[PDB]
Amino acid sequence: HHHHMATPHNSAKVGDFAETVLMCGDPLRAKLIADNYLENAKQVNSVRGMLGFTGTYKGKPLSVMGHGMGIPSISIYAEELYNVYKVKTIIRVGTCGTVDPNVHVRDVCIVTASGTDSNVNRMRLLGHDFPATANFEVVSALVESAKALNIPTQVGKAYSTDIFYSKEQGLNEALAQYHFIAVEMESAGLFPIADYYGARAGCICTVSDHIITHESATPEERQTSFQNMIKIALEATLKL
Numbered sequence: 706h707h708h709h710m711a712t713p714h715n716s717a718k719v720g721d722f723a724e725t726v727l728m729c730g731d732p733l734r735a736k737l738i739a740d741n742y743l744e745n746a747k748q749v750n751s752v753r754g755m756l757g758f759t760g761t762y763k764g765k766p767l768s769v770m771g772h773g774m775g776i777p778s779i780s781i782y783a784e785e786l787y788n789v790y791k792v793k794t795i796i797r798v799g800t801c802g803t804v805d806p807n808v809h810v811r812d813v814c815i816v817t818a819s820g821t822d823s824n825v826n827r828m829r830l831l832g833h834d835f836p837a838t839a840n841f842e843v844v845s846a847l848v849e850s851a852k853a854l855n856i857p858t859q860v861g862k863a864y865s866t867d868i869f870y871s872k873e874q875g876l877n878e879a880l881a882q883y884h885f886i887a888v889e890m891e892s893a894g895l896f897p898i899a900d901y902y903g904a905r906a907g908c909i910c911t912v913s914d915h916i917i918t919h920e921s922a923t924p925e926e927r928q929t930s931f932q933n934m935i936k937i938a939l940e941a942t943l944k945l
């Protein structure tokens with residue numbers, strides 16, 4: 706069988722995504738979000754296993770889709786969502802490590818901007834420094850939703866690396882010196898794409914591991930932190 710492909714990576718028909726989309730790296734987590742938090746839900750994509758779904762959260766249209774791991778992968782999916790699917794707001798709902806001595810496993814981090822070791826943003830701004838910056842209304846909606854839910858949060862910079870298995874001496878010490886709160890792999894690729902399209906993006910992540918102390922969240926602890934983060938993100942969509 707053959708379906709028309711609106712993009713090379715997505716079989717959803719134009720219009721099948723809501724204007725607001727949550728994205729997480731793991732397509733199986735996108736399915737869990739749809740199954741446990743969306744109503745009126747339909748699967749709209751499964752190309753390359755990258756499951757995506759559209760429904761409603763408290764009556765408001767909302768989609769959720771996986772983005773895979775790394776800047777190049779999220780860039781494909783987000784470019785398509787903003788361009789072909791006419792999405793207006795994407796919130797990445799992720800996991801991360803931390804080096805910050807005052808950030809702990811299970812903490813919820815709301816990202817204001819993200820550094821990177823990728824070249825993708827230099828390529829957009831004539832080789833210069835282009836800060837991957839979250840939209841202020843999105844950051845504010847996340848912060849205010851967490852406050853109303855009485856869930857503490859850390860607010861600050863992320864660092865999006867191309868290399869999960871770092872061999873780079875001095876990186877963690879510099880990240881700590883400048884109070885980067887989250888180490889992940891995608892957000893610095895998302896924010897400039899939103900800018901290109903005049904659209905909005907943000908990111909919220911839970912700390913799975915402390916890169917310095919080697920503390921690590923158990924499976925049960927990751928489920929609880931996920932439940933906190935996803936409720937914050939879902940409630941924030943109602944303000945966006």
Ligand SMILES: Nc1ncnc2c1ncn2[C@@H]1O[C@H](CO)[C@@H](O)[C@H]1O
Nearest residue numbers: 730774775800801802888889890891
């Ligand atoms: N310690 C970490 N370093 C890099 N990426 C991380 C880390 N913890 C979680 N992630 C996120 O999960 C995936 C890597 O396991 C990526 O999609 C990334 O954004």
Ligand SMILES: [Cl-]
Nearest residue numbers: 712713714753
């Ligand atoms: Cl392809």
Ligand SMILES: [Cl-]
Nearest residue numbers: 734737928931
């Ligand atoms: Cl999960």
